[PDB]
């Protein structure tokens, strides 16, 4: 959960396909449809990553934990890379 | 209802998409169209949160309760995060 | 692993059939099905190579190593050619 | 090895039965089965020659040398004709 | 022309996009550029409607007629709705 | 016509492709080109639905009837679902 | 009909050729041509499945039933697999 | 049924004539004509094997069992070879 | 001409060799070369039938009549089968 | 020329391959390359038809005549169908 | 130059793609980059046309002539249509 | 410098974007930040032009010359138009 | 606390967004809502800074300390810059 | 740090994508979220550059140094161009 | 380097595939990934050319030289054509 | 070279096998591999002809001459037919 906070910049510059994590967050009620659509209407992938990351940090640490779990299963290689550095 | 008052600053710094809560408040007659439009014409999201929060506290505690319910359903994760701290 | 980074342009201009490496990466959980499909829906082979290479560098160096191994077994002649130059 | 590069057009317009060279390249790990099959599924013999030649130049100069050896043994008359002109 | 006067409140609460009527009034010399700009610098749509309506009633009944014509062509459905009630 | 009013929230959360209804409303003079364009320049589909619905309620009940007819032909399944509940 | 809702994620990750179900839905007026085309212009099969599933849930439960019937006849093995788990 | 899953790569690299298994799957309603045709329009035999295998795993484990039976009767030697290793 | 419309699904699932009807339609100016080529570049025969049928219904009923005549002469047995059922 | 105006909806719902008419309009200076590209970047064929039709009506009646001629030669069957109804 | 003034309303309701004329005006020093950007940040095409037209009339008649030339070359059909009416 | 004085009314009714001239005047110490902000807090563009023009005439003729230079470079077309009349 | 007094002019000419400090002062009962509103209704930012600074010095040194703390957290860079000079 | 001051006008007219520098400044506590949002809500890129530059000069020279570093890494070519002139 | 400036309009109307030059500029640190993505998200090829050209002129003349070199190698025929005219 | 321009439509409707001319253009550096691949990924032969012709006209007249030579040798009969008419 904190790991997201210490890795905000790397997560924006590295996270790729957001459809998986967005759907997982939606199904965990972290994000409503409107919130997800707002995330997706950004022009650039770094912009989309910033939108998603900020929207989730504002939700608190529990939701940050849910996001971290969803990334760790949707993209375990990046999570592991960051966590060991 | 009080919970809003003890969490004014956190609610301004955390609340995100206000369209849901604004529409819910409108449909509960807490806010008229003009009031909602005045809330939305602020430049920044913290400014919008301040406008909405102040406009609702002035209405009394019953309306504060309606606002709290609307947040608890539109953004339950932040509500829960705050309530457990 | 680094060797991929020093040879980004050559690898895009030289790598050929990507089905082998894509399947190997999928089976090593570097890429999910969706990610692989996104790689394959590019129009041109240089575009496909760019998509795959960028998608893998973002994953970190461990995944870059997995990709390098998969190329070194799927197309050893190009790997050797580059590595000796 | 270079000789292939200076004679790309002549080699596409002259090379005939590709089964010998394709099998030799396969046994020298220049081409995998999938790569060979992709070469053979072209409609025309000039198309097949183009596919094979491009697929091999991308592999580097060492593989170009292997291809040249295989042609020089599978079709020495054309190789000699070109080399003396 | 009178119809505007008997429907001041409904016209403020119902009229929508004012660009059409403002341009028509400008081209009929009912409003100068400065007057139109003053109408548009109000914060809310009900405020803009009030500004425009008052600014036009002050001009007299002839200008009220011009405004009514411009609404009846720019937004005939609302005009008809009101006129039959 | 009323049915739209009792189902404002459901219609915003359910209505999908608006091109059909927007074109039908345009051809019934409920909406001018400018009004339609203003509806389409919203970021989100719920935002677009809100814009369209509000813009039409302001026009009166006759225009609400036209909108209801256009939905009942462009998307009869949702209309029927709502009407039986 | 509900079965679709409890199996949203599995249905997106499992459903295959959508031409059959799309045509059946079209012939049952669940989807217009435009809606079907919007479903088909997505890049990936999981994206297409998400588009179709969401577009149908919004239509209500009756249309969800029609979709379920069309899947149960177009792809009975997956339907049965899911229903027994 | 599982045996297919543990032997995905070997089954793609080993399975040969698919007409028998495709017809058997068709007659067991695992595959419709359209699905079978989509399998057959791939360029390469490894591509065809991948298409068929993925299309069947998505159908569930029961259909995987049907596919395994059809292979075990259409090509028992490969099945036995794999199963004893 | 109508008979085509009442038998859209059967005609897609039954029509076979389209070269005859495509050439006849071309010679009756129902289809230009480009249109015919677009019909032929579909992957599957049901896809080709759908493309042709839709492309012709859009042309009107006269062209549907021309198509029906061309089928009735190119494949009279299917036409008769359908017409008597 | 008018015929286009009385048949706007039918022309959007019926017109098919637009490459012919777009090229003809380009060569008659009705459309510049940029305008044609803007027409082609729409997602759906009805969207493309709407874009083209609106872009041409705005140009005046002479350009509408040019468009009608180009359709009458590129797709005479639909033109005739509409004109006789 | 005057022709623009007598056709202000038609030019706002008819002019389409403004990128060409905006770039031409920029290269003729009628508009600076900031002015062009201000024109482009309007929401609607009629709004953009109004902004551009007003911004140019204020510049005088010489600049109106430059704008007219740029339209007459970027969109000659509309210019001709208007000029003959 | 005088030219500003003989063209006070035209300059208020014609000058457009003031950001350029305001910044230039600031950098030439004709206006301090406070003075510039006071100019910008007027409601209307004619009001802003009046404020700026009066504030500069009061400064003397040298500052009027600086303002004229800044307009002649920021908006040469209007300057030329006026100067030749 | 004194530091504010020795830096009155610099603090008026440097302090930027006052919303943070105003809210902090309000929550520390240094300023009532009316006082804050009076601060915000000034035209210019230097005027707003003067109003706030004077209103706080009049309150005494304890309130000056509260204001200094709020600036040091809301805008630490300016505070540090001044304090080291 | 000074280099920013001697190049204020060039930096406003040249700086491009501000997302990088804004995020870097945020992470160096030069700018709070509110300040960054205020910078981004300007209409034009020159306006955004002016807002950012002024907001940073007010912070002092240390923050100007941080901004210069962030530009020198986010856009080294422009920095170098200016510094050598 | 200047040659780009004297040929801005021709370069926007002539430059074709931008992937090569964009990648070369990226590898020469003229453009970051975000900048390149912003260039690619434009709708039209002339729009993309304008975005790239403006983004590079702002960087200075050295970067303009890098861009010119990359075009002269990626598309030498157009460069030569322009340079001799 | 011009002859291509006066015969754009005929050349798109007549040119046949493009492999010869594409390879010749590649070997004359008129087209890079990526450009050639982009030409070949069009669906229809008229589309491919349009892509190639436009891509070459943009390159200038020298490249148009190279293309004309390559056609005159790869397909002399069509060239002669057109040139004598």
Numbering used by the authors:
A (entry chain I), B (entry chain M), C (entry chain E), D (entry chain A), E (entry chain N), F (entry chain J), ...: 451 to 535
Paper passage:
NLRP1 and CARD8, two related inflammasome sensors, are highly expressed in a number of cell types and play important roles in both host defense and human diseases. Here, we determined the cryo-electron microscopy (cryo-EM) structures of NLRP1-CT and CARD8-CT filaments and analysed their assembly and specificity.
Given the predicted 17-residue unstructured linker between UPA and CARD, we proposed that UPA and any residual MBP molecules must be flexibly linked to the core CARD filament. Because of the small type I interface, the filament structure looks almost perforated with visible gaps. Detailed inspection of the three interfaces revealed many charge–charge pairs as well as other hydrophilic interactions including R459 at type Ia with D473 and D477 at type Ib, K509 of type IIa with D525 of type IIb, E507 of type IIa with R464 of type IIb, E479 of type IIa with Y527 of type IIb, and E483 and E487 of type IIIa with R495 of IIIb. In the model in which the type b surfaces of the CARD8CARD layer interact with the type a surfaces of the caspase-1CARD layer, the charge complementarity between CARD8CARD and caspase-1CARD is apparent, especially with strong negative (CARD8) and positive (caspase-1) patches both mainly at the outer rim of the filament cross-sections.
